[PDB]
C-alpha cells in the first residue's frame, strides 16, 4: 500500500544551562531508522534500524551536517520567537518540526508535509499545495512574510518531491523484509468478574505491524462504541504494537458480545466471543 517517511525535530531551550537540546528522529511508516541527540558524545546521526546500516560514510556525514545545521538554526529561532512573544530569557521553550512525504503502492509521490510548532502549538505550516504557508498567529505571520520573500517554499517542495521520495523508495527496497511485512495481530480474550452481576471482557491484539488497527465491541450486532474502554495503541518494544478494548457486561450475558479486529495483515477481520 502507501508509505510515509517522516522526520521529527525537537529543540528545547534551557536558560543558564547552556545550549538548547536538539533531538532528531526519522521514521519510515511505524519504524524508526535514525536519530541524533545534540547532548550525546558521538555528535553523529546514528542508525536505529538494520536496513539503514548499509549506508556508507558519505551518507552519515551529510545527514550529520543536515541535523547539526538545523540545530543551529533552531537555536537562533528560539531567541527570535522569544522576542516575538515578548517572553523572558528565564523560561524553557520548545520548537518542533515535522516533515516528510507519502508515496503510493506504485512508488509515486502522493504528498508532502512540513509543519512547525512553538511550545506545543501550531506555529507555521506548508500548505498541501507546497507553495503557500498558513501562520497560526501574528508572530508566525512575521515568519511567513520572511519565508515568502526568501522563496522558502520552493526549496522545500523540491526536497519533498525529489530526495524525500527517492530515498523513501530506496529504504522500502533495502528494508523490504521488515518495512513491507505485515504482522497480523495475535488475539485473545480475558474475563474478570467485578461483582456477582458485572464482568469485564477484554479483547487483546498483540504482535501486530503496522500500528494501525481497529478493535470494536458489539452486543447482538449493535456497536457498543460508547461503552468500550480502549487503550492507546502501544509499542511492544520489538517493533510490533499492542492494543486492547474492554466492556463491562452484565454477568451471564457474555455470549451476546463479540469483539471485532481489523488489520491490514488479516486475510479477513477476526471476530472473538467469550
Amino acid at each position: 500500500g502507501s508509505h510515509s517517511m517522516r522526520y521529527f525535530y525537537t529543540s528545547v531551550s534551557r536558560p543558564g544551562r547552556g545550549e538548547p537540546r536538539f533531538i532528531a528522529v526519522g521514521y519510515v511508516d511505524d519504524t524508526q531508522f535514525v536519530r541524533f541527540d545534540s547532548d550525546a558524545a558521538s555528535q553523529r546521526m546514528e542508525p536505529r534500524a538494520p536496513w539503514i546500516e548499509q549506508e556508507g560514510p558519505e551518507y552519515w556525514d551529510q545527514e550529520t551536517r543536515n541535523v547539526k545545521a538545523q540545530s543551529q538554526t533552531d537555536r537562533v529561532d528560539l531567541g527570535t520567537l522569544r522576542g516575538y512573544y515578548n517572553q523572558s530569557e528565564d523560561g524553557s521553550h520548545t520548537i518542533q518540526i515535522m516533515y516528510g512525504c507519502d508515496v503510493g503502492p506504485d512508488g509515486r509521490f502522493l504528498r508532502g508535509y512540513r509543519q512547525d510548532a512553538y511550545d506545543g502549538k501550531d506555529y507555521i505550516a506548508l500548505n498541501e499545495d507546497l507553495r503557500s504557508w498558513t501562520a497560526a498567529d501574528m508572530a508566525a505571520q512575521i515568519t511567513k512574510r520572511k519565508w515568502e520573500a526568501a522563496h522558502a517554499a520552493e526549496q522545500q517542495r523540491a526536497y519533498l518531491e525529489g530526495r524525500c521520495v527517492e530515498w523513501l523508495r530506496r529504504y522500502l527496497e533495502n528494508g523490504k523484509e521488515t518495512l513491507q511485512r505485515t504482522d497480523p495481530p495475535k488475539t485473545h480474550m480475558t474475563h474478570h468478574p467485578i461483582s456477582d452481576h458485572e464482568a469485564t471482557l477484554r479483547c487483546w491484539a498483540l504482535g501486530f505491524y503496522p500500528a494501525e488497527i481497529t478493535l470494536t465491541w458489539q452486543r447482538d450486532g449493535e456497536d457498543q462504541t460508547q461503552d468500550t474502554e480502549l487503550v492507546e495503541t502501544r509499542p511492544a518494544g520489538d517493533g510490533t504494537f499492542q492494543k486492547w478494548a474492554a466492556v463491562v457486561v452484565p454477568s451471564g450475558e457474555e455470549q451476546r458480545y463479540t469483539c471485532h479486529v481489523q488489520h491490514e495483515g488479516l486475510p479477513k477481520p477476526l471476530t472473538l466471543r467469550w
Binding site: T73, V76, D77, T80, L81, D116, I124, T143, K146, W147, A150, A152, Q155
Partner: peptide, 4 residues
C-alpha cells in the same frame, strides 16, 4: 537561513 531560512530564519524564522
Amino acid at each position: 537561513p531560512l530564519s524564522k
